Amino acid sequence: WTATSGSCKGRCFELQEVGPPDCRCDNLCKSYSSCCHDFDELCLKTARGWECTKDRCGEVRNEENACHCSEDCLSRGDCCTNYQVVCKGESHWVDDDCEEIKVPECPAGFVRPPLIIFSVDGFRASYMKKGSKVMPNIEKLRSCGTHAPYMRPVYPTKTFPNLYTLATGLYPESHGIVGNSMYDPVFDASFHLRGREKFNHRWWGGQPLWITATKQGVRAGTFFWSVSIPHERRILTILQWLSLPDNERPSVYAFYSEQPDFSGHKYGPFGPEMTNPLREIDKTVGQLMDGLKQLRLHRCVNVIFVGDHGMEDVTCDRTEFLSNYLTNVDDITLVPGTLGRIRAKSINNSKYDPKTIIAALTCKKPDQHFKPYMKQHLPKRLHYANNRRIEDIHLLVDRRWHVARKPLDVYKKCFFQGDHGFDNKVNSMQTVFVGYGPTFKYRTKVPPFENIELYNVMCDLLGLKPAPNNGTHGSLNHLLRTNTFRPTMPDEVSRPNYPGIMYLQSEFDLGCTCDDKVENKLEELNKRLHTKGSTKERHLLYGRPAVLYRTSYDILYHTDFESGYSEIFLMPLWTSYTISKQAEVSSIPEHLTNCVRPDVRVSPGFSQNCLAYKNDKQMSYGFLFPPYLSSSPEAKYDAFLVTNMVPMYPAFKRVWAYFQRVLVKKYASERNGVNVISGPIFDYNYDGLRDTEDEIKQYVEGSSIPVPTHYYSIITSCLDFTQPADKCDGPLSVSSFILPHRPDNDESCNSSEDESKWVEELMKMHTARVRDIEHLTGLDFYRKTSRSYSEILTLKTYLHTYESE
Ligand SMILES: *[C@@H]1O[C@H](CO)[C@@H](O[C@@H]2O[C@H](CO)[C@@H](O[C@@H]3O[C@H](CO[C@H]4O[C@H](CO)[C@@H](O)[C@H](O[C@H]5O[C@H](CO)[C@@H](O)[C@H](O)[C@@H]5O[C@H]5O[C@H](CO)[C@@H](O)[C@H](O)[C@@H]5O)[C@@H]4O)[C@@H](O)[C@H](O[C@H]4O[C@H](CO)[C@@H](O)[C@H](O)[C@@H]4O[C@H]4O[C@H](CO)[C@@H](O)[C@H](O)[C@@H]4O)[C@@H]3O)[C@H](O)[C@H]2NC(C)=O)[C@H](O)[C@H]1NC(C)=O
Ligand SMILES: CN(Cc1ccc(Cl)c(Cl)c1)C(=O)Cn1cnc2ccc(N3CCN(c4nccs4)CC3)cc2c1=O
Ligand SMILES: [Ca+2]
Ligand SMILES: [Cl-]
Ligand code: NA
Numbered sequence: 056w057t058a059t060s061g062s063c064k065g066r067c068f069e070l071q072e073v074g075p076p077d078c079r080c081d082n083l084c085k086s087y088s089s090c091c092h093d094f095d096e097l098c099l100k101t102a103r104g105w106e107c108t109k110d111r112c113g114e115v116r117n118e119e120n121a122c123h124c125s126e127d128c129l130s131r132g133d134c135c136t137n138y139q140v141v142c143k144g145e146s147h148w149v150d151d152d153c154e155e156i157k158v159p160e161c162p163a164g165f166v167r168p169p170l171i172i173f174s175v176d177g178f179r180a181s182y183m184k185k186g187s188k189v190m191p192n193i194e195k196l197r198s199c200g201t202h203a204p205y206m207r208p209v210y211p212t213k214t215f216p217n218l219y220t221l222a223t224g225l226y227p228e229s230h231g232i233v234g235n236s237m238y239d240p241v242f243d244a245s246f247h248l249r250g251r252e253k254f255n256h257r258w259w260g261g262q263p264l265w266i267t268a269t270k271q272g273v274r275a276g277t278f279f280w281s282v283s284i285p286h287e288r289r290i291l292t293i294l295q296w297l298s299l300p301d302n303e304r305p306s307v308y309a310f311y312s313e314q315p316d317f318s319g320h321k322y323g324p325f326g327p328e329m330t331n332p333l334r335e336i337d338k339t340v341g342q343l344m345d346g347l348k349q350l351r352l353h354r355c356v357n358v359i360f361v362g363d364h365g366m367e368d369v370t371c372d373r374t375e376f377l378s379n380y381l382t383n384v385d386d387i388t389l390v391p392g393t394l395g396r397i398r399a400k401s402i403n404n405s406k407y408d409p410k411t412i413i414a415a416l417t418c419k420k421p422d423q424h425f426k427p428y429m430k431q432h433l434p435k436r437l438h439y440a441n442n443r444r445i446e447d448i449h450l451l452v453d454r455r456w457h458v459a460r461k462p463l464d465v466y467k468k469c470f471f472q473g474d475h476g477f478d479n480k481v482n483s484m485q486t487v488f489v490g491y492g493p494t495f496k497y498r499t500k501v502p503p504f505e506n507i508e509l510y511n512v513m514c515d516l517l518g519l520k521p522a523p524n525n526g527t528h529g530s531l532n533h534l535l536r537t538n539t540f541r542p543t544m545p546d547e548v549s550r551p552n553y554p555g556i557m558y559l560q561s562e563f564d565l566g567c568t569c570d571d572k573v574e575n576k577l578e579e580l581n582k583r584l585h586t587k588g589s590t591k592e593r594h595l596l597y598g599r600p601a602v603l604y605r606t607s608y609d610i611l612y613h614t615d616f617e618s619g620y621s622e623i624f625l626m627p628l629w630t631s632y633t634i635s636k637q638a639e640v641s642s643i644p645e646h647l648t649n650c651v652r653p654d655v656r657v658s659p660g661f662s663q664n665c666l667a668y669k670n671d672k673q674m675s676y677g678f679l680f681p682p683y684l685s686s687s688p689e690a691k692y693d694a695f696l697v698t699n700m701v702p703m704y705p706a707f708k709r710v711w712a713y714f715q716r717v718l719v720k721k722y723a724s725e726r727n728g729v730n731v732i733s734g735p736i737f738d739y740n741y742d743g744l745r746d747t748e749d750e751i752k753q754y755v756e757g758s759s760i761p762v763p764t765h766y767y768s769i770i771t772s773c774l775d776f777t778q779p780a781d782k783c784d785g786p787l788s789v790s791s792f793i794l795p796h797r798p799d800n801d802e803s804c805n806s807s808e809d810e811s812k813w814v815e816e817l818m819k820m821h822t823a824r825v826r827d828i829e830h831l832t833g834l835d836f837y838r839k840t841s842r843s844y845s846e847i848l849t850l851k852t853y854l855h856t857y858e859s860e
């Protein structure tokens with residue numbers, strides 16, 4: 056019950072929302088069907104439209120009108136946006152030359168530059184160039200402010216997960232809005248675009264910007280708008296709020312547009328019907344800028360123009376149906392469309408097997424336009440697993456396609472020509488970012504970045520301390536004229552040990568064998584210099600990684616590589632080596648095939664053993680530094696140390712051995728040397744964070760040797776590839792991956808073929824930011840460079856995507 060028989064007189068678009076059963080006049084009341092009886096009359100006036108005309112200039116104030124052209128309107132704060140243009144001979148904002156905003160030029164009483172978020176649904180990145188002739192206000196924002204060529208949304212590339220990601224800096228897995236449609240098994244309730252369930256706070260985690268603002272004494276209301284309030288009224292409302300007295304006036308404002316997504320769905324991303332929605336969004340931006348100029352706020356406010364996701368060509372005939380794969384299709388519930396999420400229809404079924412379903416969906420058709428995954432096996436870059444609302448079975452749907460359960464689901468719901476929600480690396484899913492105002496830089500291009508980063512920037516723009524989030528604070532410092540956040544490197548928590556030769560060969564009982572005892576004083580202090588770290592500047596280019604948790608580990612130096620050896624996990628946390636453009640690939644000699652050597656620097660008790668691998672029929676082993684890239688036959692012996700060995704499934708070894716033997720050399724050839732840091736990752740609970748010892752679910756049979764869930768590599772070179780990796784004076788170039796450590800290659804449908812047909816493609820899918828690797832390892836990389844820390848932060852957030860142009 057709302058006793059909707061109070062009034063909105065003097066209360067239109069009030070900022071504080073009022074408690075029941077007393078009726079509401081806030082910008083959300085229409086959503087709850089709880090507005091006072093007079094809201095439309097008072098708060099949603101439309102009379103005479105949205106523009107001033109000559110015949111309206113200097114009129115007698117008529118309170119019925121949607122906006123005013125009378126003399127008093129400036130001081131009342133409620134002119135039509137074009138008032139100064141029509142009735143004062145002033146020019147539109149878009150027609151003024153763009154002048155650098157060196158300092159905030161605000162009216163008296165403004166304590167700080169207000170922030171205005173202008174968000175646009177389904178605004179694909181390429182619209183910036185492709186729609187440029189019809190969007191002059193937007194193009195002026197772009198060229199005059201700071202802009203990226205695109206901004207990367209989060210997966211799934213749906214509206215709600217992305218807008219709430221913008222507001223919180225959190226992955227959907229952490230904020231809870233994991234889809235446009237969601238079932239929570241605990242709530243036994245469903246969240247939809249339609250309906251009243253979405254209004255419940257229990258779905259929405261994290262701390263949105265407006266709450267971060269309010270708690271630190273910066274005024275801000277919700278970013279939400281009821282859909283029935285037209286766009287013109289939203290602009291006029293924001294402009295009215297901006298006219299409030301200093302102690303009432305909010306510091307942050309948000310405008311939302313359902314366009315161009317709405318038409319995009321009907322007409323496809325580039326349908327001839329798409330020109331008009333783009334025109335209209337530009338007009339709206341123009342109204343806001345004219346309005347700000349009127350209030351002399353146009354060189355005072357910071358404006359963000361930002362989209363939630365792109366739009367792809369998708370039609371009904373491009374639907375894969377699960378009923379073409381499964382016979383038991385009525386046993387399952389599917390979240391359909393541009394992604395798939397499958398769960399049991401009845402939770403009262405103990406004869407329900409996810410394994411059998413995955414298998415029935417795996418590589419079943421040659422053309423297959425989806426790939427099934429257990430959620431923990433999804434690419435770690437998607438960060439799409441750690442939430443009870445995310446189904447164990449996920450379908451990654453190919454761009455341009457849909458998944459549905461049965462044909463009846465499509466025809467009894469062709470309506471659509473456009474959709475979105477695909478993998479966030481997909482070009483068509485990319486969206487937009489423009490920043491304009493005194494705090495942003497002038498006429499500046501920045502590289503593409505992820506929408507998870509914006510929360511921190513908006514906090515900075517408002518003098519707020521950000522709530523804990525998934526951005527890397529400082530990675531977007533290059534967007535801003537004046538910063539206020541100075542990032543610092545996390546302190547190293549564990550200092551390494553530097554062990555010398557401490558054990559005799561006969562102290563080891565590892566069950567290992569090596570054909571090695573084929574024994575000059577010239578070449579003998581030289582070998583000792585390598586174990587002491589003479590070649591360390593060659594192979595460790597950016598300093599040792601800092602271990603950011605409490606542990607026991609040893610630095611181990613060799614001719615060809617250096618490692619950080621964990622006495623707890625019985626393997627390296629990292630292994631660092633440099634392969635120049637000129638270096639040679641050799642083989643593992645016949646006599647050294649099964650060679651594993653005790654490391655006289657590390658105790659029997661802190662070493663792996665060969666017996667464990669013999670007894671484990673599933674588990675083989677591989678090496679972190681590759682023997683194939685030894686600099687000399689004699690240095691090759693170092694690669695076979697027990698301290699360089701890691702557990703590997705035979706199926707995974709196909710992947711690793713091809714990466715090591717072929718790809719590292721290919722990257723060194725193409726990039727003029729590479730530095731490689733490789734290591735294990737443990738993430739049994741799939742939270743995207745380093746597991747502690749007692750979270751490990753699998754060991755090599757009969758041992759304390761823990762089994763990695765993933766293997767990483769960070770591959771760094773000089774951005775200017777005319778300089779070799781090991782002599783590089785300026786910025787760096789990086790690509791990384793996090794390969795899942797799996798006992799089969801079911802993920803790669805062509806894996807029965809030569810590694811050269813499938814291995815590289817898999818690695819590409821599992822591309823990663825260094826930052827992802829840091830969370831997963833508790834390591835901190837690039838500690839010693841000639842580069843600024845902000846630049847290094849940007850580098851750590853880079854993701855090599857592998858998409859075309
Ligand atoms: C992306 O950024 C975010 C934010 O920085 C990172 O996520 C954080 O990770 C932390 C570690 O995983 C986690 O800290 C824990 O908090 C626990 C209390 O959590 C509540 O309070 C906070 C603070 O206000 C709040 O944010 C949380 O909100 C969550 O929960 C509700 C649902 O109930 C949702 O509305 C909301 O969306 C959010 O859900 C998300 O997080 C939860 C986990 O909290 C997930 O389950 C969801 O899937 C979803 O992703 C909470 O309301 C607290 O219990 C923890 O303390 C334990 O661990 C410490 C370790 O030092 C130890 O000392 C203690 O012993 C303690 O153990 C005890 O509890 C155990 C479990 O109950 C029990 O087994 C033991 O026996 C002990 O009794 C811990 O401090 C933090 O909550 C989240 N924050 C958010 C917002 O998600 C995230 O990691 C980043 N991602 C990446 C990849 O880097
Ligand atoms: C599509 N857009 C745009 C949009 C803008 C910004 C973002 Cl961040 C997003 Cl995700 C979407 C809508 O605005 C649609 N729409 C409409 N009417 C609503 C009415 C009440 C709610 N509730 C959400 C939960 N809840 C919370 N209060 C504080 C924290 S969570 C109560 C309010 C939500 C809506 C709502 O979403
Ligand atoms: Ca973990
Ligand atoms: Cl969804
Ligand atoms: Na074995």
Ligand code: NA
Nearest residue numbers: 800801803806
């Ligand atoms: Na396969």
Ligand SMILES: [Zn+2]
Nearest residue numbers: 177316320475
């Ligand atoms: Zn949409």
